[PDB]
Design a protein around this nucleic acid. Structure first.
Ligand SMILES: [Mg+2]
Ligand SMILES: [Mg+2]
Ligand SMILES: [Mg+2]
Ligand SMILES: [Mg+2]
Ligand SMILES: [Mg+2]
Ligand SMILES: [Mg+2]
Ligand SMILES: [Mg+2]
Ligand SMILES: [Mg+2]
Ligand SMILES: [Mg+2]
Ligand SMILES: [Mg+2]
Ligand SMILES: [Mg+2]
Ligand SMILES: [Mg+2]
Ligand SMILES: [Mg+2]
Ligand SMILES: [Mg+2]
Ligand SMILES: [Mg+2]
Ligand SMILES: [Mg+2]
Ligand SMILES: [Mg+2]
Ligand SMILES: [Mg+2]
Ligand SMILES: [Mg+2]
Ligand SMILES: [Mg+2]
Ligand SMILES: [Mg+2]
Ligand SMILES: [Mg+2]
Ligand SMILES: [Mg+2]
Ligand SMILES: [Mg+2]
Ligand SMILES: [Zn+2]
Lengths: 239, 52, 146, 81, 101, 83, 66, 90
RNA sequence: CCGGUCCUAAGGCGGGGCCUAAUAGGCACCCGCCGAAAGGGAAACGGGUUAAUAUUCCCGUGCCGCGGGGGUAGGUUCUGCGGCAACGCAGGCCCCGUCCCCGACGCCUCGGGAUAGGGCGGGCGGGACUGCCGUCCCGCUUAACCGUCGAAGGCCGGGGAGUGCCGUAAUGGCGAGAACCGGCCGAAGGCGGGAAUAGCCGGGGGUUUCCCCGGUCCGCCCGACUCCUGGGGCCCGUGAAAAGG
RNA sequence: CGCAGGUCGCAGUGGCAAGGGGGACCUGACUGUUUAACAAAAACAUAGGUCCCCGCGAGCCCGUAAGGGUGUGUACGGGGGC
């Protein structure tokens, strides 16, 4: 037809969907975990970016968390406000001291954790405003945000860091990783297309496109989408 | 290959079976309705005014 | 009715080997049942010729010659015949069992056993005769090893 | 429930050699129904019932009687022989 | 020494595991004789490897080669009859493979 | 039947009958033996080859039987005794 | 089919047998008690075989030479 | 030896007074010895078979089992025939 | 007792609800169901028979599930017995709950053990050839099921080791417990029973497929792509679930 | 697996089976994919590089709507260009 690939992605086809049946479950904090727990397993999850620890609470509730680097099987973790700020412990942001490296941070209490969930990532506890029950934290991107002090986080940094430094040496390796992730692999460049299939397709000497405005409709909003700038000058202006 | 060589692959599959309601070879086994009378997706008989 | 099919089924051989005597050509048309075919087989008008087994006299003669050592020269080899990995396995097992038996019986100090064991693993010795000759020449045992 | 009897060569050989009667019955009849029907109608004891559906769409039953009743004798009694 | 006559121990291995008994004799460095009475706790009088018994804090006063009723009067003097009848309950969910490597 | 035998889920066993023929029998593979709930290793006294379900197996004469091994049971008993 | 070695054990099954089949060889006799469930076979010396057949016929168990 | 578990079960059952189980255990011990010896002789492992037969002779002396002696005599006759054939061929 | 039938997978359908001008249109929600004749998964094999069915018919020998009867071990306030232990042994009955485990899992590589099949020398029986020699070929088989044995591997008790000691195909192992001694659990498969009474080879008699006689053996070798077992390595790839047990 | 001797032919991996080789330029790194039925390529993809929109009640996309995909996810991440 004429609808482009980014428009076809939103339909939810099998080649664009995530095979989450390959995973044991969501890696989130259950709503009402408290007390001491035991690290029983550290497992690989297909398509995820870090090893996943299985924590067995003292009252029998078991949940999945991202494993802190240095966490080991048989370890005893503490959950709750009374938990000390040691590695693997799940503490409120309000109780966590400043300068602490946490991960799996909850923006609001009870969502399960949103930020610093990739391997080798972490958030830094910058400050505490207890009079509005907020915690200022720096996310992995360098952005400083306020989060609910009653929310929960884990002390330490996410294990599995350095996974992306090693090159994906063959196309087959990225193929096998894509089959576990949700990516459609591989991707055709826009200018390698014909004009019916992409705005960049067409001419005898095919060319890319200049940036489109932020108000551009779907099917037109490809390439640079309302970019502040492009290239090395843009990076320089950013820094 | 699209002609005679591809015709040899039509020897073992099927899209339709006989419909229990209308008896035609029109019951779509995967979609689970009849393409002639509409049984399985419409309790009223499927018949359109554009068809003689 | 096909007589040969019933006869082959009865005799438990191939239809290619079932043979019908021409003297029963008149009686073939009256054959109705496997009992009738059994009656003809009992009379001997239907029989099974013996199967052919490939004769092996030529092979046995050539195998004797090959055991003596003929017909295995450079012009008769087309691919790999010797297995290097299997040869290494056999070489290690022979030398290790010999040295371990000597140490178990006490003819070799464990340190000398260690030196010989590491040399064997490191491919110092061509064969068991070489190992025995080394042991006798360097006097690593109180009595000579045969 | 019984439609008729099968008096072919195979059925006659089975009757004479194995004490079996061959009947054509309704396609919906089960082995239990066939055995009870045979016992009620003919007052014999049924040993076992084997059933099949022919390529012409009929149910045929081989009814093996107990060891006190003759299938050939029963066929002669009903006169279907 | 901990494993001594008059000591209350709990058998850890075998059929009688988790059951309490009283050490009444010493065989050698490897074996001692235990009889936490079979009518009382269920541990018949016999030798046991000291590695297969876990000593408790409790201890009673009896003489070497003491009899079953001697151990019985010692336990009732200490008030330990119900403690001897109780069977130890493990918490299997706590143990990880590091503990049994 | 035939595709079920083309799949490798059953064992292909060649056997010579008393009638002099060679036939292929398709037999089930053995079921896995019970494992310890902590270590995952096979439990002693219960690791005999079993080929079908519904066969009652006798557990070893110990508390918790074919659920945990003697090592886990003894260590847990020691911890509970101290605790 | 099951095999028994002790005559005392085998007699408990053979006494209830529907039939006892006898097979003879130069050194030993196979006695096979055919019950509803199983066929119990024991190999015995010929003299003990004769004694057991005599006892079984005394108990009025059927005996057949196979 | 090989059927020591059967010997221990026999004596344990007799001490406990289970005559039926004692008879079953005696049968199992005889089965153990005779089956293992017969398989060894059929595979022509005569040294292992002779060790098993000596153990069976000791067990039959210890437990008063005539069937064990009879089957051992049959197996020893077979062993003698095998050894005679080996000596004649060699 | 061979498959469907049962289970769930990717997924789908129906009702309720929400949406819709409306429906026979949509589905995040709740409930139920369907979804594999190659996945998971109860239990049958050998011989004979027909013109045509053959794990279905017949003979023989068994297995599974459900239910019952007798005997037995056991029980009848209370608990089964033995062993230091690994663990072994008939281990009472009925109902309910919970937990755990099996079900349940990739690819590559190399060690070990078997079996199917194949071959060699001898023996017996039968067949092929007739220019010379006397060689060549065929048969000599053993199902499911019951019992017993059990390689690797793991484990228990004793022992208490650093001039080390013990090794592999290869990596190697030891006071965080080695060498060494004894024991426990434990494959394919073997063997006995089944079962020679079958089948087969040969030699006769009768007649519509029945009866009789002889043999169906001895010693070795190779050996899988079939079956079992263990070791090692790779993954930004981790190689299903449920019924059922 | 090897050694010694003898011996025939035109021919001994004798049939069967069974690489011609080398130098230089252009071009695409490579393996892979492509116009079923005239194009197999220097075209596409590729690992690698780099830029942009995005802190998640996001960015991008699908649906009339109810709502949905990315997402059982979280910047060592999702999406979009070269
Ligand atoms: Mg995909
Ligand atoms: Mg183009
Ligand atoms: Mg434009
Ligand atoms: Mg356009
Ligand atoms: Mg253009
Ligand atoms: Mg077309
Ligand atoms: Mg289709
Ligand atoms: Mg040649
Ligand atoms: Mg090499
Ligand atoms: Mg049927
Ligand atoms: Mg299946
Ligand atoms: Mg399977
Ligand atoms: Mg279904
Ligand atoms: Mg046919
Ligand atoms: Mg021969
Ligand atoms: Mg090697
Ligand atoms: Mg050619
Ligand atoms: Mg290229
Ligand atoms: Mg190429
Ligand atoms: Mg073309
Ligand atoms: Mg072309
Ligand atoms: Mg390109
Ligand atoms: Mg580059
Ligand atoms: Mg540009
Ligand atoms: Zn229809």
């Amino acid at each position: 037809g004429k609808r482009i690939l980014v428009q076809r992605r939103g339909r939810g086809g099998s080649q664009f969907r995530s095979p989450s049946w390959k995973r044991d479950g969501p890696v989130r904090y259950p709503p009402n975990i408290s007390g001491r727990g035991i690290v029983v397993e550290i497992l690989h999850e297909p398509g995820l970016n870090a090893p996943v620890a299985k924590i067995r609470m003292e009252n029998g509730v078991e949940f999945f968390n991202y494993a802190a680097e240095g966490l080991y099987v048989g370890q005893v973790i503490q959950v709750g406000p009374d938990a000390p700020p040691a590695v693997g412990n799940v503490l409120p942001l309000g109780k966590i001291p400043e300068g602490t490296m946490v991960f799996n941070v909850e923006k609001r209490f009870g969502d399960g954790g949103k930020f610093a969930r990739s391997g080798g990532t972490y958030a830094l506890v910058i400050g505490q405003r207890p009079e509005e029950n907020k915690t200022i934290v720096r996310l992995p991107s360098g952005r400083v945000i306020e989060v609910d002090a009653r929310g929960r986080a884990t002390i330490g940094i996410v294990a599995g860091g350095g996974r992306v430094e090693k090159p994906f040496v063959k196309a087959g390796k990225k193929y096998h990783r894509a089959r576990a992730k949700s990516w459609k692999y591989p991707t055709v460049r826009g200018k390698a297309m014909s004009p019916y299939a992409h705005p960049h397709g067409g001419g005898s000497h095919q060319k890319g496109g200049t940036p489109v405005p932020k108000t551009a409709p779907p099917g037109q909003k490809v390439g640079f989408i309302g970019s502040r700038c492009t290239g090395r000058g843009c990076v320089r202006a950013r820094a | 290959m699209k002609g005679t060589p591809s015709m040899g692959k039509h020897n073992k599959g099927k899209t339709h079976i006989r419909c229990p309601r209308c008896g035609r070879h029109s019951y779509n086994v995967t979609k689970k309705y009849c393409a002639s009378c509409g049984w399985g997706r419409s309790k009223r008989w499927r018949r359109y005014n554009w068809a003689k | 009715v096909d007589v040969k099919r019933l006869a082959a089924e009865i005799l438990g051989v191939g239809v290619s080997r079932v043979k019908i005597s021409p003297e029963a050509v008149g009686r073939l048309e009256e054959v109705v049942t496997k009992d009738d075919v059994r009656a003809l087989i009992d009379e001997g008008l239907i029989w099974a010729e013996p199967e052919k087994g490939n004769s092996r006299g030529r092979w046995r003669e050539l195998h004797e010659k090959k055991k003596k050592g003929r017909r295995r020269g450079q012009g008769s080899r087309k691919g790999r015949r010797l297995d290097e990995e299997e040869a290494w396995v056999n070489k290690m097992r022979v030398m290790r069992r010999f040295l371990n038996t000597l140490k178990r019986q006490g003819k070799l100090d464990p340190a000398t056993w260690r030196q010989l064991y590491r040399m064997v693993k490191g491919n110092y010795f061509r064969d068991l005769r070489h190992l025995k000759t080394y042991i006798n020449e360097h006097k690593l045992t109180k009595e000579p090893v045969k | 429930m019984i439609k008729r009897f099968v008096i072919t060569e195979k059925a006659l050989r089975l009757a004479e050699r194995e004490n079996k009667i061959t009947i054509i019955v309704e396609r919906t009849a089960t082995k239990k129904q066939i055995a009870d029907e045979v016992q009620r109608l003919y007052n014999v004891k049924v040993e076992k019932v084997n059933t099949l559906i022919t390529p012409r769409g009929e149910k045929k039953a081989y009814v093996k009687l107990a060891e006190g009743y003759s299938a050939m004798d029963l066929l002669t009694k009903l006169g279907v022989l | 020494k901990v494993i001594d006559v008059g000591r209350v121990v709990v058998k850890v291995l075998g059929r009688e595991a988790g059951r309490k008994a009283v050490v009444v004799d010493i065989v050698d460095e490897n074996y001692v004789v235990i009889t936490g009475p079979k009518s009382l706790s269920g541990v018949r009088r016999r030798r046991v490897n000291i590695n297969h018994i876990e000593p408790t804090d409790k201890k009673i006063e009896i003489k070497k080669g003491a009899s079953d009723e001697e151990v019985l009067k010692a336990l009732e003097a200490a008030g330990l009859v119900e403690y001897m009848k109780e069977r130890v309950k493990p918490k299997l969910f706590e143990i990880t493979p590091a503990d049994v490597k | 039947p035939r595709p079920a035998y083309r799949s490798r889920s059953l064992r292909r066993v060649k056997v010579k009958t008393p009638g002099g023929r060679t036939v292929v029998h398709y037999e089930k593979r053995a079921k896995g033996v019970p494992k310890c709930a902590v270590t995952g290793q096979p439990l002693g006294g219960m690791n005999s080859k079993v080929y079908r379900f519904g066969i009652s197996t006798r557990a070893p004469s110990r508390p918790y039987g074919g659920v945990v091994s003697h090592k886990v049971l003894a260590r847990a008993i020691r911890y509970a005794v101290r605790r | 089919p099951k095999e028994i070695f002790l005559v005392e054990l085998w007699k408990k099954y053979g006494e209830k047998a529907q039939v006892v089949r006898v097979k003879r060889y130069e050194d030993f006799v196979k006695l096979k008690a055919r019950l509803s469930g199983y066929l119990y076979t024991i190999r015995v010396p010929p003299d003990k075989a004769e004694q057991l057949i005599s006892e079984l016929k005394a108990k009025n168990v059927k005996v057949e030479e196979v | 030896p090989l059927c020591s578990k059967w010997e221990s079960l026999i004596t344990w059952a007799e001490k406990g007074g289970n005559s039926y189980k004692a008879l079953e255990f005696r049968e199992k011990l005889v089965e153990c010895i005779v089956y293992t010896a017969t398989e060894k002789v059929k595979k022509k492992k005569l040294d292992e078979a002779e060790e098993l037969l000596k153990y069976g002779k000791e067990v039959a002396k210890k437990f008063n089992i005539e069937e064990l002696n009879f089957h051992i005599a049959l197996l020893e006759k077979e062993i003698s025939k095998i050894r005679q054939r080996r000596a004649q061929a060699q």
